């Protein structure tokens, strides 16, 4: 199967989101369950993103103020502004990291059911607003080629 892009359907994007969230929560010791080189590369890119982010800025969760009623709008506002003037792989990694932070904060704030919702919101946003761009810019394959090297 070398003729088409890796993870080229919404079903694959869903799997990518669920595995990402499981990883980000596992880094905190929180167990949760709802292309392999793709999952691996995204783990690495998000971790390296976070390292850099934290060198410059305070904890991402400091800015959130989650409640069950407002979490969806909070997510939508941030992600809309992130992509308002365009998409690139760096912004996509930022999107995954933001989603991860939202999930971690939900669990910290004893709102663990929100994790399942956030997973849904990320999957829908990916499929509605990023997937076209991903296919048009080389698939997850291009991401693996660009972000594969560990620096």
């Amino acid at each position: 199967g070398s003729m088409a892009h890796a993870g080229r359907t919404g079903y694959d994007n869903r799997e990518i989101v669920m595995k990402y969230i499981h990883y980000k929560l596992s880094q905190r010791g929180y167990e949760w369950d709802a292309s392999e080189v793709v999952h691996l590369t995204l783990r690495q890119a998000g971790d390296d993103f976070s390292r850099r982010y934290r060198r410059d800025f305070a904890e991402m969760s400091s800015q959130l103020h989650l409640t069950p009623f407002t979490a969806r709008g909070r997510f939508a506002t941030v992600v809309e502004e992130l992509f308002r003037d365009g998409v690139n792989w760096g912004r996509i990694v930022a999107f995954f990291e933001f989603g991860g932070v939202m999930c971690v904060e939900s669990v910290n704030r004893e709102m663990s059911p929100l994790v399942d919702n956030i997973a849904l919101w990320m999957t829908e946003y990916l499929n509605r607003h990023l997937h076209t761009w991903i296919q048009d810019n080389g698939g997850w394959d291009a991401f693996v080629e660009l972000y594969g090297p560990s620096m």
Binding site: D56, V78, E81, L82, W89, G90, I92, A94
Partner: peptide, 20 residues
Amino acid sequence: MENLSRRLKVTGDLFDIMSG
């Protein structure tokens, strides 16, 4: 909020320029 998205965006943009 807006501040958060700007931080995510600029960090993202840096990371995508570095990949180039």
